């Protein structure tokens, strides 16, 4: 049994990704029995868009040789691994945006032989930061474990031997203004506090939490990934060093009967759509709708602007009637405000139809309606042109 | 609950289409309660192949410049929007099929520079005619609403700015010999006539009909699209101006519980196969079988001759035993006659096997039989090479 639809309550800033960053959502919610006492309390939680992973911007330097001959004419191109200092200088000159950097790269003019050395920097790339060990993770780094970049070496290795990575900032500096304060009620069984109800009105289970510390304030990393600052049992252990890695969760799967029909099946249908996306290297609005979370827990929304895959963090709320999401023609309420549309494209595959009317793939299907606009498929370019071959 | 198989009773002339003209069939039949009185009567209905949409043949003119240089050698090609009179003359000369038209186009011979102006006409293209407003609809026309072509401008715009469209006839002339007469029984509840039984023996519901007029004879456009000439209530309104547009039906969906298991599910499975076709731009005999109507109502059959997608109008009848459709080896009865096979290819994915035996994908599957011939996939070329990019 699942709700008919879910809609994000708050949307974080959009960020670009490729098909390989997609992941099937988690449809499990933990319920506890015996917590019958509620008492108002105040708590602190991370703002939207920072809960998943703090991201550090960067850039990659890949050098290539632009030699040629000179009446003869023939071009020659070979790659090399550059030095961090020249890489940083190149980045500064590209940040200036001066034409001098553009020419120093675009036109070789190697005119007996003549050669012109060149250093090419790729569009900014982002890498997740791990708070516990101050390590940067990303697909570009070989093995997905780059450690102590700030502590020891300003540059990190890349899969391409002639490519290196550089953070935009000289040092890994992270702003600590990532906390918001909300009200809630505390659910207590006996004396222990089994769970708390949040501002959105959704019950959060405190079972299976671990102690973490961000920005010097101690907190708990919940089962779903949300972090809240509250009192913690001394018995509770510290979070395992490994973070941001392939799913390695244990208790929930064994303790909660993963209902075959309710969870395993939905997971298989989602995996079918995800596999089709990877094989065909293209997406459609209908297929994007299959990656939506079916429960109120925190998740990730997807959309496509300028033929680029986009994603953001969000909190999902259940919907009982299609009237609430679409009160009148041309409005999709989000947080009580008509959400704006970029080129008539909403999140999670919702689009504006040719008749100037909001179309929801799971709403139209329930009415036996069909439209060719949703089916149309469009290819998505890979995020890493050079680093990953 | 659905019948095991359905077979067309009468097949109209075949016409060529592409993958984008496909649409999932309608599996809903309307049943009325209380009509217990039957009385023989005579009625008039449209012939097969005209029920869906009267089609007007046409052609598109796209001009290109064949300039070059002249010992130097270099070719130059740029497009332009031509004039209707030269377009018509070009069409007449191409209709003549004389070699003079072929050379005037195929060989530029632009031999200091030299140029040769050329006007290219595309293979005939067809456009649906709307009887109510005498307007021509087609994907080639921008926005899908070309109006008053005969009334005001002989040529209509196309998505490509250098392309225009021309009907084959100088004026939109439509033959009115599209009517056939059949017997039937009239189902009456109280005094009002709720429905009528047709010649094929299938009950037709008169609920939700609208008054239309074709060829000057007043009639009713039924829910399923069939038009019959009979007595109409004055209370019944005229059909809404909009026709041949994205599904905008309302009463049937709300009034008839679209059984989740019976209709919504089948619709989802059909949409999955249709989406796969659009993404891969290729079809297979097994996948074509998923677009067949599961009920006796009027529909459209599909097949592939000379690697070209084909379609036609048909009336479907239910089948109780596989013996009736295939009485002996090598015969598929249609209308009481063994249907002929073009290159061993029948309609709706039915093919002639290597053993000289008729194979039905939904019959072989029910016997756990499997064959590689049905799975094989073949690409289909897009219908509009220039108009649509």
């Amino acid at each position, epitope marked *: 049994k699942f709700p008919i639809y879910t809609i994000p309550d708050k949307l974080g800033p959009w960020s670009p990704i490729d098909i390989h960053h997609l992941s099937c959502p988690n449809n499990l919610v933990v319920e506890d029995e015996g917590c*019958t006492n509620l008492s108002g309390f105040s708590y602190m939680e991370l703002k939207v868009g920072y809960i998943s992973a703090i991201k550090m911007n960067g850039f990659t330097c890949t050098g290539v040789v632009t030699e040629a001959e000179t009446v003869t004419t023939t071009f020659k191109r070979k790659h090399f691994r550059p030095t961090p200092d020249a890489c940083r200088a190149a980045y500064n000159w590209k940040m200036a945006g001066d034409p001098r950097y553009e020419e120093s790269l675009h036109n070789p003019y190697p005119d007996v032989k003549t050669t012109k050395e060149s250093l090419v920097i790729i569009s900014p790339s982002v890498a997740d930061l791990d708070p516990y060990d101050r390590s940067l993770h990303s697909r570009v780094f070989p093995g997905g474990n780059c450690s102590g970049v700030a502590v020891s070496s300003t540059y990190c290795s890349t899969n391409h031997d002639y490519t290196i990575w550089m953070p935009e900032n000289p040092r890994l500096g992270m702003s600590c203004d990532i906390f918001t304060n909300s009200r809630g009620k505390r659910a207590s069984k006996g004396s222990e506090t089994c769970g708390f109800v949040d501002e959105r009105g959704l019950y959060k289970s405190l079972k299976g939490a671990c102690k973490l510390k961000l920005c010097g304030v101690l907190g708990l990393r919940l089962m779903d990934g949300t972090w809240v600052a509250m009192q913690t049992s001394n018995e509770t252990k510290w979070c395992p060093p490994g973070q941001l890695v392939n799913l390695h969760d244990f208790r929930s799967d064994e303790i909660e009967h993963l209902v075959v029909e309710e969870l395993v099946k939905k997971r298989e249908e989602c995996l079918d759509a995800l596999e089709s996306i990877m094989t065909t290297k293209s997406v459609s609005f209908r297929r994007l709708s299959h990656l939506r979370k079916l429960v*109120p827990g925190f998740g990730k929304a997807y959309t496509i602007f300028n033929k680029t895959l986009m994603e953001a963090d969000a909190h999902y*709320k259940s919907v009982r009637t299609w009237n*609430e999401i679409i*009160p009148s023609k041309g409005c999709l309420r989000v947080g009580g405000r008509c959400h704006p549309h970029v080129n008539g494209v909403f999140f999670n595959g919702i689009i504006l139809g040719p008749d100037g009317n909001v179309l929801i793939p799971e709403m139209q299907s329930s009415l036996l309606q069909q439209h060719m606009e949703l089916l149309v498929s469009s290819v998505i370019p890979l995020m890493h042109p050079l680093a990953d071959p | 609950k659905f019948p095991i198989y359905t077979i067309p009773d009468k097949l109209g002339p075949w016409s060529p289409i592409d993958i984008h003209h496909l649409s999932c069939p309608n599996n809903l039949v309307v049943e009325d309660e209380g009509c217990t009185n039957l009385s023989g009567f005579s009625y008039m209905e449209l012939k097969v192949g005209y029920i869906s949409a009267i089609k007007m043949n046409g052609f598109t003119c796209t001009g290109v410049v064949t300039e070059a240089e002249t010992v130097t050698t270099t070719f130059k090609r740029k497009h332009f929007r031509p004039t209707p009179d030269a377009c018509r003359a070009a069409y007449n000369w191409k209709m003549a099929g004389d070699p003079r038209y072929e050379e005037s186009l195929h060989n530029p011979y632009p031999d200091v520079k030299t140029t040769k102006e050329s006007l290219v006409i595309i293979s005939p293209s067809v456009a649906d005619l709307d009887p109510y407003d005498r307007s021509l609809h087609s994907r080639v026309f921008p926005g899908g609403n070309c109006s008053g072509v005969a009334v005001s401008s002989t040529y209509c715009s196309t998505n490509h700015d250098y392309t225009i469209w021309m009907p084959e006839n100088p004026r939109l002339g439509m033959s009115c010999d599209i009517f056939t007469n059949s017997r039937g029984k009239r189902a009456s509840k109280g005094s009002e006539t709720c429905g009528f039984v047709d010649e094929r023996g299938l009950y037709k519901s008169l609920k939700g009909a609208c008054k239309l007029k074709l060829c000057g004879v007043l009639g009713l456009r039924l829910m399923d699209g069939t038009w019959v000439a009979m007595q109409t209530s004055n209370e019944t309104k005229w059909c809404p101006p909009g026709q041949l547009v994205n599904l905008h039906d309302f009463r049937s969906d709300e009034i008839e519980h679209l059984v989740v298991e019976e209709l919504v599910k089948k619709r989802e499975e059909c949409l999955d196969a249709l989406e796969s076709i659009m993404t891969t731009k290729s079809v297979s005999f097994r996948r074509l079988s998923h677009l067949r109507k599961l009920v006796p109502g009027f529909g459209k059959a599909y097949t592939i001759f000379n690697k070209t997608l084909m379609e036609a109008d048909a009336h479907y009848k239910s089948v109780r035993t596989w013996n009736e459709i295939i009485p002996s080896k090598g015969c598929l009865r249609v209308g009481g006659r063994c249907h002929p096979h073009v290159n061993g290819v029948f309609f709706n994915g039915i093919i002639l096997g290597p053993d000289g035996n008729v194979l039905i994908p939904e019959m072989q599957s029910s016997l756990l039989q499997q064959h590689m011939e049905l799975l094989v996939s073949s690409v289909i070329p897009l219908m509009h090479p220039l108009a649509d990019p």
Partner: antibody, heavy 122, light 109 residues
Framework: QVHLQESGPGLVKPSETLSLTCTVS????????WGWIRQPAGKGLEWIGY???????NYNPSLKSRVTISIDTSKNQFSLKVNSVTAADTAVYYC?????????????????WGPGTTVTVS | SVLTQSPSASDTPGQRVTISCSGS????????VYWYQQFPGTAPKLLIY???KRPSGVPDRFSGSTSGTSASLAISGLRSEDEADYYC???????????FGGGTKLTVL
């Protein structure tokens, strides 16, 4: 802890309107649906409809034309008005907090019901 | 779509009684079922807060089970205080409204 009390007219002449209103005490009105249930004397229960703290409304199709529901969060009170009163209208009306099945996992179903108030038609 | 329930039930003391509600796919096959208990002249109260779960303060002899399209509420032990009218409620996706079945009146014998 939270409890509701119904208030309003007991008898009403035909062709008039009903002004029944109930108050909420001990808890906030946010994140909950609020609806009205009526029961003819000796027969089964019927669902008039509900309203959300946001203000979206929903009504029983059989009474969609005659009933309107209004809410005022500033004073923790929601009311129900019926446009036309007939002899059929006489029934016992109940106020109830509607906790949707999937809205909050902590609360399921119509938790709290106020004391039934009778309405008669002369 | 509607919910169908027995008009009345009767049984000797100390005997298991079963009350059954039958619904369509969109009523029981898609949403949870809640059973209410109403004494005469009093507002109804929620006997079970989920198809199987019991709210606090309910005697353990009450237990409900849900089939794919039907529900059932069985009382293992019959007591003089169990005589009440029982009404089953469920949500309907297509209707978009709550549906109440015909209440069954249980009388001890």
């Amino acid at each position: 802890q939270v409890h509701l009390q119904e208030s309003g007219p007991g008898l009403v002449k035909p062709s008039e309107t009903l002004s029944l209103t109930c108050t909420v005490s001990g808890d906030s009105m946010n994140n909950f649906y609020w609806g009205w249930i009526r029961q003819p004397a000796g027969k089964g229960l019927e669902w008039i409809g509900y309203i959300y703290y946001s203000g979206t409304t929903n009504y029983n199709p059989s009474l969609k034309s005659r009933v309107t529901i209004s809410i005022d969060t500033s004073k923790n009170q929601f009311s129900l008005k019926v446009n036309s009163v007939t002899a059929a209208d006489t029934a016992v009306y109940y106020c109830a907090r509607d906790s949707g099945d999937y809205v909050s996992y902590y609360y399921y179903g119509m938790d709290v019901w106020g004391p039934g108030t009778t309405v008669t038609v002369s | 779509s509607v919910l169908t329930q027995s008009p009345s039930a009767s049984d000797t003391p100390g005997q298991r009684v079963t009350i059954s509600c039958s619904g369509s796919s969109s009523n029981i096959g898609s949403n949870y079922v809640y059973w209410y208990q109403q004494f005469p002249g009093t507002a109804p109260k929620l006997l079970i807060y989920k198809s199987d779960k019991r709210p606090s303060g309910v005697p353990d002899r009450f237990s409900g089970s849900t089939s794919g399209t039907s529900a059932s509420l069985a009382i293992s032990g019959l007591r003089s205080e169990d005589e009440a009218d029982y009404y089953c409620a469920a949500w309907d996706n297509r209707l978009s409204g709550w549906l109440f079945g015909g209440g069954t009146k249980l009388t001890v014998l």
